[PDB]
Amino acid sequence: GTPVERYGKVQVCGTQLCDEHGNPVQLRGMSTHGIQWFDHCLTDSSLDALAYDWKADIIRLSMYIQEDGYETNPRGFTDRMHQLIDMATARGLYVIVDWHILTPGDPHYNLDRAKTFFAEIAQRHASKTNVLYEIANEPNGVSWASIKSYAEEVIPVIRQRDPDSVIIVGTRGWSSLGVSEGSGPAEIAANPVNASNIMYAFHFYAASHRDNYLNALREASELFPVFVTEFGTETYTGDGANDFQMADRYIDLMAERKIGWTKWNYSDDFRSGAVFQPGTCASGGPWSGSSLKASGQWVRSKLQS
Ligand code: NA
Ligand SMILES: [Zn+2]
Ligand SMILES: [Zn+2]
Ligand SMILES: [Zn+2]
Ligand SMILES: [Zn+2]
Structure with a gap:
């Protein structure tokens, strides 16, 4: 069976994401890059490869709002998101719908749009059981209390x-659980979003984010999903040299704690973090082998187990 068939209607259980029979499950996969720039990398062929060859459980559909994204054509971007949600579902994948705020960093800047x-x-x-909603990619420059109040404005619209x-729900400091802004996950646990079936986002770049980030992820996983x-x-820019040794420490921790992940990113952007070599998408593949950057071969190998 596909991932969706095997785990069904996933729900939070205690501090973990579970399958529909209460077994903790770790969903692993890939994030798209922004669909305003790399829409051409998301085709029948590339998505079939991700599902059937790479054996991803989940795809995150990253829709920037600014940076030539949603705000420039709400109707067109929404229709493409519907199409991509259906395509992912027709390949047996879980889907994260990523409201990809970044700059401006206050999620409230995009609240009215987000509700729509x-x-x-x-x-x-609503009838699908394989769609998860990511309501604010990377909050930055804002307090945890303001992210919580934002979440409490959007959650009821969805629910x-x-x-x-x-x-x-995104977290402080580019979803670093507050680490990048001098805090940590204890802040969330002390003042959690007043809803259940909630998870909290953490983002890291292994070449830049060392033991203090790894420790925060371990800490958070004790307290909430x-x-x-x-x-x-690679580094926090999404470019530069890979640190696979550090990355493997994160991978081992996430496997131990059944923390799901989607790697940035499934595109042929020039940066080292984009799994394909520039030109791959225009060429229609291949989506393996000589078209993969080092980070691409590394993640594909993880996903294939
Ligand atoms: Na980025
Ligand atoms: Zn196909
Ligand atoms: Zn541009
Ligand atoms: Zn539903
Ligand atoms: Zn990011």
Whole structure:
């Protein structure tokens, strides 16, 4: 069976994400890059490869709002997201719908848009059991209390239409559980989002983010459910040299704690973190072998187990 067939209607159980029979499950896969730039990398061929060859459990659909994203054509971007959600579902993948805020870093800047978009997505896809909603990719420059209040504004819009879906909430300091802004996950545990079936996002880039980030992820996983919706093996820019030794420490921790992840990213961007070599997408593949950057071969090998 496909991942979706094997785990069914995933839900939070205690501090973990579980399958529909209460067994903790670790969903591993890939994040797209921004669909405003790398839409051409998401085709029948490339998505079939991700599902059937790479054996990904899950795909995160990253939709930037600024940076030539959603705000430039809400209707067109929404229609493409519907199409991609259906395509992922027709390949047996879980899907994270990623409201990819970054700059501006205050999620409230995009709240009115987020309510409109998520209302449409949740209504259309309410009958699906494989869709998770990521309501604010990388909050930055804002307090945890303000992220919590943002979450409490958006969550009811989704839950009104799709009550039984998992929502992933971004965290302080580019979703570093506060680590990058001098804090940590204890702040969240002391003042959690007042909803259940919630997970909290953590992002890391292994060449830049060492033991203090790894420790924070371990710490958080004791207190609440974490999903690593974005990570890289290189520096925090998504480029530079890989540190696979450090990355493997994160991978081993996530496997031990059944923390799901989606690696940045499934595109042929020039940066080392994009799994394909520039030109691969225009060439229609191949989606393996000589078209993979080092980080690409590394993650494909992890996913194939
Ligand atoms: Na980025
Ligand atoms: Zn196909
Ligand atoms: Zn541009
Ligand atoms: Zn539902
Ligand atoms: Zn990011």
